[PDB]
Design an enzyme around this catalytic site. Structure first.
Site, PDB file in Angstrom:
ATOM      1  N   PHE B 201     -55.009 -50.756   1.013  1.00 23.82           N
ATOM      2  CA  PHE B 201     -56.076 -49.978   0.409  1.00 23.82           C
ATOM      3  C   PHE B 201     -55.772 -48.480   0.514  1.00 23.82           C
ATOM      4  O   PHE B 201     -55.209 -48.004   1.503  1.00 23.82           O
ATOM      5  CB  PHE B 201     -57.416 -50.260   1.075  1.00 23.82           C
ATOM      6  CG  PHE B 201     -57.918 -51.683   0.966  1.00 23.82           C
ATOM      7  CD1 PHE B 201     -57.325 -52.621   0.149  1.00 23.82           C
ATOM      8  CD2 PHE B 201     -59.001 -52.082   1.734  1.00 23.82           C
ATOM      9  CE1 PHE B 201     -57.822 -53.935   0.099  1.00 23.82           C
ATOM     10  CE2 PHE B 201     -59.502 -53.372   1.658  1.00 23.82           C
ATOM     11  CZ  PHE B 201     -58.918 -54.276   0.843  1.00 23.82           C
ATOM     12  N   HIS B 291     -54.740 -54.675 -12.477  1.00 26.47           N
ATOM     13  CA  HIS B 291     -55.192 -54.185 -11.190  1.00 26.47           C
ATOM     14  C   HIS B 291     -54.337 -54.802 -10.083  1.00 26.47           C
ATOM     15  O   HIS B 291     -54.345 -56.022  -9.921  1.00 26.47           O
ATOM     16  CB  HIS B 291     -56.645 -54.511 -10.926  1.00 26.47           C
ATOM     17  CG  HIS B 291     -57.052 -54.033  -9.580  1.00 26.47           C
ATOM     18  ND1 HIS B 291     -57.078 -52.695  -9.259  1.00 26.47           N
ATOM     19  CD2 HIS B 291     -57.300 -54.701  -8.433  1.00 26.47           C
ATOM     20  CE1 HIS B 291     -57.367 -52.556  -7.982  1.00 26.47           C
ATOM     21  NE2 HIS B 291     -57.508 -53.759  -7.455  1.00 26.47           N
TER      22      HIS B 291
END
Ligand SMILES: CC(C)(COP(=O)(O)OP(=O)(O)OC[C@H]1O[C@@H](n2cnc3c(N)ncnc32)[C@H](O)[C@@H]1OP(=O)(O)O)[C@@H](O)C(=O)NCCC(=O)NCCSC(=O)c1ccccc1
Ligand SMILES: CC(C)(COP(=O)(O)OP(=O)(O)OC[C@H]1O[C@@H](n2cnc3c(N)ncnc32)[C@H](O)[C@@H]1OP(=O)(O)O)[C@@H](O)C(=O)NCCC(=O)NCCSC(=O)c1ccccc1
Lengths: 378, 379
Positions: B201, B291
């Site tokens: 992340f 994505h």
């Protein structure tokens, strides 16, 4: 071919709290009976609230099991979320089933879902949970509006309008649901705003079906969503603030909110109706659904627009019988107006008038307006 | 006359974290050097991550000042929110100014704002804060998308399309911004998913301007947003879950997410293209912005669609240089694709190809697809 509201359904939790009894309840269950100063103030606020009763999910047993909920500032978000992330979609489901029944078409015909709540937040969200509860098509196109606040009953109509008008045959289910357990706080003389929320805030859900080009003699439109406008009122950022914190959803309300609304209503009404008609409007020629954030807000709209006695009856009726339920409230008001118009034998759903407006008011301060047309009762 | 993407801008926090150094950093600053078991696992995840570096707002000084952030389960939402409710609109502002510059019109022409973030929540929201920062018209029509998650980079294009097409003359500023400070958690063998998020992340913001009927003297379209579809993959509710708690934004990631994506990709691509022309095969004819929720998701899309070597280069490049920044990532990928297309002298912004797709994947599992057409690179 504008988007039309084809159905409205509403729901509330089962527990009724009559305002006459609420100060005794609140001070007893939160162990504040010794604070006679706060009690007298809360009594005066309740006397001015123009709210006779409210429906609330929260019960005394829940407070006993979770006393951090009434202990001001104590960590309690987790227990609040565990409640609201379940109860918000469930109350939304009840309202949605009522709207769908009125609409009269299969659930499989819904193409779009807008879910709105300021009472919880989770991933996946309330929209996902509602899809499961209702058995909506897994490919419904979703918009999940979290933590917008009290203007959003108008905003969701604006969004539904665009989705319905830009997608041939689309049918949009719009659900707004609020459970104020997340906003319940105990009493401290350092945060008096809580007394106002304790007097006014309430639980409820609405559901609306929106579609353009309704099928003649099959779908029955109630209102047409003609034009919308959203604006920020100048110099009012402190008006309504709410923060998502370890202690729950904390909030602050400025005493100047009503005056800000009154100081801008001519302008925001004028600019909204400019999007439709070049002629100046007579405000008394309209029907109104005004978000009753409190009774003073309603009074300010009435005063500055020069509205005649009784013009805001439907708005005041909902505030009286349900309190301020957040975003769903203006939909309760449209439903009430439609129902009273049937009772009185009016020619249209808008009190016999052609044009009207929905006024949502919330953080920013932000005002969103939706210009409506009524539809014939027959 | 479909909505067009007229500009794309991006931004990231200034602090760069090279993946080769991140295990040492993470274990040192969280006081977990004794957890050699978890360090081994984390090294293996980082080796497989296909992420070379990430930009992060969070610093060691912030962790020292707020050690509850790395103390698993300790109360820390308030300090996280105090950071992110400020930093998210600020990062969005930086991206937005770049998009606005490219677009070439005055800010007064912006009629709509969509702000999307899964990193914070407040009332008034990030949209309101961005209006202040940029000096947008106070009557911009706003959509504030909180906590949707990783499909939303496609979803915001879908929303912008409807707003731009239904409101004549509308110009929609779309800003997606993520600051993962709210998702940072310490290390426990009872919640190994955190090792995956710790490896992947990252922080970033995108800004996109969307409008139909481009103004010939000023505006230069990059892509056309043709059709969109959102769907829930069956039996995958446990795939990605995130809860907003006293300890911050907690998350769970099923190891089966890549398999769910691979098992459904032919179907969701087919159903998407049914809205256009009925395409059912020969997926290599398209350009892609996928994505990159993790490298295994990218590999599953490649494998199950039969994509040739290099088809997903732009996607992999962004994953490598930025990591998984959430919703903005697919916009970074479109920007990269446009940039590389210019560099290579391609005829269009989509690697020379005419048709393409954006694939967003997040909680549900939910997949949102947007079918795009490219635009000519003129010469
Ligand atoms: C019904 C009231 C509150 C009071 O009736 P009035 O006719 O004004 O009669 P009075 O002047 O006699 O006042 C009585 C006493 O109350 C006191 N006091 C008043 N206001 C405040 C205050 N802010 N803060 C602290 N105290 C306040 C006042 O000082 C007085 O004290 P004393 O008696 O002298 O000790 C009326 O002003 C009203 O409707 N306000 C609008 C409420 C509003 O903003 N709603 C919308 C936002 S909701 C939202 O966004 C949201 C929803 C869900 C979740 C999250 C967010
Ligand atoms: C890069 C990995 C993680 C590993 O490479 P691979 O080729 O698979 O190589 P390996 O199979 O050797 O695995 C190495 C080790 O990792 C372990 N392990 C793997 N997965 C898990 C797991 N869930 N949970 C726990 N452990 C896991 C695995 O067991 C193994 O352990 P050992 O070495 O045997 O001790 C790849 O699986 C991938 O891309 N996954 C997709 C990530 C994904 O779902 N992204 C989308 C959601 S993001 C989102 O929605 C969000 C974003 C922001 C905020 C909030 C939410």
């Amino acid at each position: 071919q504008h988007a039309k509201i084809l159905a409205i359904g509403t729901a509330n939790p089962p527990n009724v709290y009559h305002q006459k009894d609420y100060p005794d309840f609140l001070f007893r269950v939160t162990k504040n009976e010794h604070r006679t100063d706060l009690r007298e103030k809360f009594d005066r606020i309740c006397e001015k609230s123009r709210t006779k009763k409210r429906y609330l999910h929260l019960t005394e047993e829940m407070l006993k099991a979770n006393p951090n909920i009434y202990t001001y500032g104590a960590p309690s978000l987790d227990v609040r979320q565990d409640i609201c992330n379940i109860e918000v979609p469930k109350l939304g489901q009840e309202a949605a089933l009522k709207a769908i029944k009125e609409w009269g078409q299969p659930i499989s015909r819904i193409t779009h879902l807008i879910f709105c709540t300021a009472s919880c937040v989770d991933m996946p969200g309330c929209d996902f949970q509602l899809i499961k509860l209702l058995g909506l098509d897994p490919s419904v196109t979703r918009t999940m509006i979290y933590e917008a606040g009290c203007y959003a009953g108008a905003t969701v109509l604006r969004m539904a309008k665009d989705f319905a008008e830009n997608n041939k045959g689309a049918r949009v289910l719009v659900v707004c649901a609020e459970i104020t357990t997340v906003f319940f706080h105990g009493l401290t003389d350092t945060h008096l705003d809580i007394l106002v929320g304790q007097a006014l805030f309430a639980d409820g859900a609405s559901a609306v079906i929106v579609g353009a080009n309704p099928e003649p003699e099959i779908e029955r439109p109630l209102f047409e969503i003609v034009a919308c406008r959203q604006t920020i009122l100048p110099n009012s950022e402190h008006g309504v603030v709410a923060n998502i914190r370890e202690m729950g959803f904390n909030y602050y309300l400025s005493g100047d909110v009503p005056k800000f609304v009154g100081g801008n209503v001519v302008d925001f009404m004028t600019k909204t109706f400019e999007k439709v008609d070049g002629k100046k409007k007579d405000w008394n020629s309209l029907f109104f659904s005004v978000h009753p954030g409190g009774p003073a807000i309603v009074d300010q709209v009435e005063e500055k627009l020069g509205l005649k006695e009784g013009k805001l009856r439907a708005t005041r009726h909902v505030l009286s019988e349900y309190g301020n339920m957040g975003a769903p409230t203006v939909h309760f008001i449209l439903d009430e107006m439609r129902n009273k118009s049937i009772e009185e034998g009016k020619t249209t759903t808008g009190e016999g008038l052609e044009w009207g407006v929905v006024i949502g008011i919330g953080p920013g301060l932000t005002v969103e307006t939706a210009v409506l047309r009524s539809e014939s009762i027959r």
